[model samples]
Target: PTDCSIVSFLARLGCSSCLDYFTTQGLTTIYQIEHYSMDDLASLKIPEQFRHAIWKGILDHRQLHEF
Candidate 1:
């Protein structure tokens, strides 16, 4: 897969502040998104709402793709 934006999941979840943060981090690909942990998730320091969307997305990722 070519580099996919972490924010591409915005199709699944919204919150540009969240996507924008990922933008700065250069978490530029779906692969990168699969890399953060449940705990590391909180390190983003986004609101709980944003974090949870990502947190849940990560869980679905691990479950489906075994990332």
Candidate 2:
């Protein structure tokens, strides 16, 4: 779960679009998904088609915790 946590933990560094998506999806708490796997997140019924791109943005922002 650490890898997944790192991903979500980095989500805060993403753009408004990414943050908005998570907000819309009701993922406000990091612990809520601390145990989720990549496949589990991919299965979420989100509106975007290129979730990987969003994930990439998150990963890219891992260095900027306050984004």
Candidate 3:
């Protein structure tokens, strides 16, 4: 969880399609994830479970990293 890459996080979530999609869309960095609005997972065409999973990861990331 500490100092992990975004790809690693996605892979951990078991979302390989998301990994591919995110990378191809230039969302390869942790900071780039900030571009996604809280309610904009729909635009990414992710699964319902993937939505919450990603949100959970993002939330946890902020919790772990917030200054």
Candidate 4:
């Protein structure tokens, strides 16, 4: 679970839209995900719980990968 790309992890949502949003937002790398904060995620339309999940997922996954 820890060994994967940010794109792969976000894609687990079963839709490419999540990845596309991140891509269009200029957060193309795993490290870039560190820029997304809880306050910043309000713009993301996913469920609150799922939003938190993604936030945690990205943070957790980002730990292993250096910029």
Reference-based TM-score of each model:
0.62, 0.40, 0.69, 0.53
lDDT on C-alpha atoms for all candidate structures? 0.64, 0.52, 0.69, 0.64
Tens digit of per-residue lDDT, candidate 2, span 14-63: 53444455666767755555455456667565445445544544454445
What are the runs in model 4 whose C-alpha is more than 4 Å off?
A: 1-5, 12-16, 44-49, 62-67
Sliding window of 10 residues with minimal summed lDDT for model 3: 30-39
Superposed by TM-score, candidate 4 places the C-alpha of residue 13 at a distance from the truth, in angstroms, of 6.7
Best model number under TM-score = 3
What number of backbone clashes does candidate 3 have, counting pairs of residues 3 or more apart or in separate chains?
A: 0
Consecutive 10-residue window with the lowest summed lDDT within model 1: 1-10
lDDT of 2 at 61: 46
> Which model, 1 or 3, shows the larger TM-score?
3
Better of 1 and 3 by lDDT: 3
State which candidate, 1 or 4, has the greater TM-score: 1
lDDT of 4 by residue, 29-52 (tens): 655557878767767555566577
Candidate structures ordered by TM-score, highest first: 3, 1, 4, 2
Clashing pairs in 3: none
> Cα lDDT for residue 27, model 4?
61
Candidate with the greatest lDDT versus the true structure: 3
Off by over 4 Å in 3: 1-4
